[PDB]
Amino acid sequence: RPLQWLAEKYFQ
């Protein structure tokens, strides 16, 4: 599953 969207959205 893609982490990219999660990384971008919450952390960054």
Which residues of this chain interact with ligand *CCCCC*, rule CB under 6 A?
4, 7-8, 12
- With H, G, I as helix, E, B as strand and everything else as coil, classify residue 1: coil
- Considering beta carbons, is residue 1 or 4 the nearer one to ligand *CCCCC*? 4
Distance of CA 3 to the CA centre of its chain: 5
Locate tokens 């952390």: which residue? 11
Q: How far is the CB of 10 from ligand *CCCCC* (least distance, A)?
A: 10
Q: How far is the CB of 1 from ligand *CCCCC* (least distance, A)?
A: 14
